DNA sequence: CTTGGG
DNA sequence: AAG
DNA sequence: CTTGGG
DNA sequence: AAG
């Protein structure tokens, strides 16, 4: 089965991802920026108990680590944690937006290629490491009142809510799949951040290309959702479109 | 004095005007128009007593007459009467707006002409007769509760509040002063509806031209305000501007 | 939580 | 609505 | 009176 | 504010 042929490629069986070929990312600040430390809004016990298992899981995975940082942004007190990084975003140097819009991306699908595989990468941003010099930027406060820990944590991977994460991830995955494209010139591969479409001229080619793509992704350290995958279909849902008979 | 040399030309001494050379005006309706009869809003006794002497004066002057008309528009219940003619205005055919704006009008004043006379015509619109076929358009209701008269009156002269009155008056006065302009080619005459500026190169020429203009206006049936007149001045107020040393 | 078109 |  | 830009 |  697809599940058992590629255990490393699926999030269900391969463990947390880590893009081993990608250098830890340095996040350049704007020329005038200095750290901003926003105090954590008090949060209800109900919210804290809701957030706690997520924090503990991320700590266990090494995705969060303790720190002391002159930067601090709040977690939203109203469960899964959402960090308000707007004041960090304002201080980080802008980058060119290179992710194509879905309409343009799909124009690259020609009618000759009507067998599709759609993969969704799980926890994609967390596969990319942050350089230790950039980790303090994203710190937040975590207090466990009935344990006694009140200090800061920060991210060791590219965080949710950071304005450049989609673009940096898309560019990293493009670097990591550049050789795959070269080895499979008969295949169309569309990338939209963590959403991938592979297109082939036949069922057989789609099957062989999907095997190759899963092998490559797993080896590089990315993880696809086995439960959401649409494998070797003549009709798929991709980026809000239903792709069917070359339409849409 | 200017008052006594031209008794016919001044409103103070010449009586109500009447432009004797101008045919009574016919007011064309739009192609689809039919009469509209708006009921008179009840008006307080205080307002009625305030309006009454004006109505009686206009009746005595023949400017208002009794009628029966399928048209009716209201008098404003909050003193001097103001008729809301907006529903008549909507039904009257539009005419080209030929009154120049003051900025453009004043551009026709050259520096060679620095002696000014400014005249303001009194009750200008009322100098123009309305054709009997057009009089019913402007009817309104007048009730004298402590006398017993409840019927309609209408205007026999061009009314205030009618959308074409400024343009029709300006065009009529232009026709009536066309010969004056021909007889006095050295003079500048600016007309803005009922506000006139005469300009000459010298005090003497301004004096002679003002005598001629007052004689002409009075003979034609128009009346100027003796109290507001600015006669043979090197500086005057005209259309919101102070004219002085060729400036403004 | 704070913030930035009838 | 967005972080 | 009724009406038609933050 | 305008009639």
Author numbering:
A (entry chain A), B (entry chain A): 24 to 101, 109 to 278
Sentences copied from the publication:
Using a host–guest system in which Moloney murine leukemia virus reverse transcriptase serves as the host and DNA as the guests, we determined high-resolution crystal structures of three complexes including 5′-CTTBPPBBSSZZSAAG, 5′-CTTSSPBZPSZBBAAG and 5′-CTTZZPBSBSZPPAAG with 10 consecutive unnatural nucleobase pairs in B-form within self-complementary 16 bp duplex oligonucleotides. Interactions between the protein and DNA are limited to hydrogen-bonding interactions of Arg 116 with the minor groove of the terminal base pairs within the duplex, leaving the remainder of the duplex free to adopt its preferred sequence-specific structure.
The BPPBB structure includes a tract with five consecutive purines (or five pyrimidines on the complementary strand), offering the first view of a purine-rich tract in ALIEN DNA. Superpositioning of the ALIEN DNA in the host–guest structures results in r.m.s.d. values ranging from 0.6 to 2.6 Å, with the most similar being SSPBZ and SZZPBS and the least similar being BPPBB and ZZPBS. It is not surprising that BPPBB differs from the other structures, since it contains five consecutive purine nucleobases; the other structures exhibit a pattern of two pyrimidine, two purine and a pyrimidine. In the BPPBB structure, the B:S pair at position 4 forms only two hydrogen bonds between O2 of B and N2 of S, N1 of B and N3 of S. The second BPPBB point that falls outside the B cluster is the BS/BS step (positions 8 and 9). For slide versus roll, two points fall in the same quadrants of the graph as B-DNA but extend beyond these values; these points are the SP/ZB point for the SSPBZ structure, in which the slide value is 3.03 Å, and the BS/BS point for the BPPBB structure, with a slide value of 2.81 Å and a roll value of −21.52°. However, the value of the BS/BS step (position 8 and 9) of BPPBB falls out of the range, with an x-displacement of 4.73 Å and inclination value of −26.46°. The same dinucleotide step, BS/BS in the BPPBB structure, has a roll angle of −21.5°. The range for roll angles in natural DNA is −10° to 11.7°. This is likely a consequence of the five consecutive purine nucleobases abutting five consecutive pyrimidines across the central dyad of the oligonucleotide.
